[PDB]
Amino acid sequence: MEAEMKAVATSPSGRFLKFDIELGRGAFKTVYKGLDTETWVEVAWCELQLTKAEQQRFKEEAEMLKGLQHPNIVRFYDSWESIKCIVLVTELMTSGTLKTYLKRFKVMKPKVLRSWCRQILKGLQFLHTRTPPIIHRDLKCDNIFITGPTGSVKIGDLGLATLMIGTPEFMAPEMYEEHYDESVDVYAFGMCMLEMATSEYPYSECQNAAQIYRKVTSGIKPASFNKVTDPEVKEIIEGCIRQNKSERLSIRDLLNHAFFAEDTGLRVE
Ligand SMILES: Nc1ncnc2c1c(-c1cnc3[nH]ccc3c1)nn2C1CCCC1
Ligand code: NA
Structure with a gap:
């Protein structure tokens, strides 16, 4: 697809690209096809529509989730706030x-x-x-x-x-x-x-x-x-x-x- 040729956004660290290819939507999430620029593995770029306490607990949550590698768990890669929405990158x-x-x-x-x-x-x-x-x-x-x-x-x-x-x-x-x-x-x-x-x-x-x-x-x-x-x-x-x-x-x-x-x-x- 042409859509697979042109990234439309990049994560703060530059690790992940978003493509304007919508994979799914629900009430809470809209998921696009993304790419890991280090491994060239396609990922899920999930956009979600909070106090500094909830922000810190969230970052700690995400750091632990990053360690959870198992064949029957959707792997979690990264998260951040974009400005506006929250982005989670997963398998x-x-x-x-x-x-x-x-x-x-x-x-x-x-x-x-x-x-x-x-x-x-x-x-x-x-x-x-x-x-x-x-x-x-x-x-x-x-x-x-x-x-x-x-x-x-x-x-x-x-x-x-x-x-x-x-x-x-x-x-x-x-x-x-x-x-x-x-x-x-x-x-x-x-x-x-x-x-x-x-x-x-x-x-x-x-x-x-x-x-x-x-x-x-x-x-x-x-x-x-x-x-x-x-x-x-x-x-x-x-x-x-x-x-x-x-x-x-x-x-x-x-x-x-x-x-x-x-x-x-x-x-x-
Ligand atoms: N990883 C995925 N691959 C393909 N489609 C996916 C997903 C997810 C999805 C799966 N696990 C997740 N954990 C935190 C956010 C999140 C999002 N959600 N979705 C779809 C988007 C709404 C219906 C299912
Ligand atoms: Na679209």
Whole structure:
């Protein structure tokens, strides 16, 4: 393309070029094709629409993210404020999210579900085993990404959520802080697996978040759970979305499950 011949912007350090090639857009981000000028690898140049405290915590967040290298984590390269928008440079995932990828297909193949879910678990395991552990807290099919031509599946949007009761005057500061452990990622994984397995959004029968909350704090499963054909798939999902977090499967349990073991390849025909 002509568009690939002419950069339209450069990062402050000169490392990354932006091209006027729009790869995707959502409510929060617009992603362009970029280029790493040192390696000539194409990257994702993501533009997002804060106090000096939030600015410093962000830079520290980004420095840690730069160290997170793993085959099932979208790699994070750099970030800065441009003037106006915020720019994050990450690994480019050519096929967008798993949510969009699933819209092209009618019924899930067991080999694909196996393979995608195994990759997601390894990414979560990688995050949970950092020093200190990283809990994604926002895992969903719309921030799990895929490169069509390899079938590589990688967790993205890490840190994005945290980048954007009582009476406030009388509220102790520690009541704003939320601590989650690994099990909220396991629950979210279970719902991703359910969505992949049914080609259907979970709790779609609900109209609002409160209805889901009434269902989800009453511990009654989404209608799609029963539309799961394979009993072993139903059992894995059930073990991930159990209401009481101490009853939930662990990531290690899931990854050791024979369901996720790889096969011996497809026979030549
Ligand atoms: N790396 C990518 N490659 C290809 N497409 C991508 C992405 C991302 C994306 C993925 N992970 C990210 N982490 C912080 C910002 C960010 C942006 N978002 N998008 C699309 C833009 C909105 C729908 C998905
Ligand atoms: Na454009």
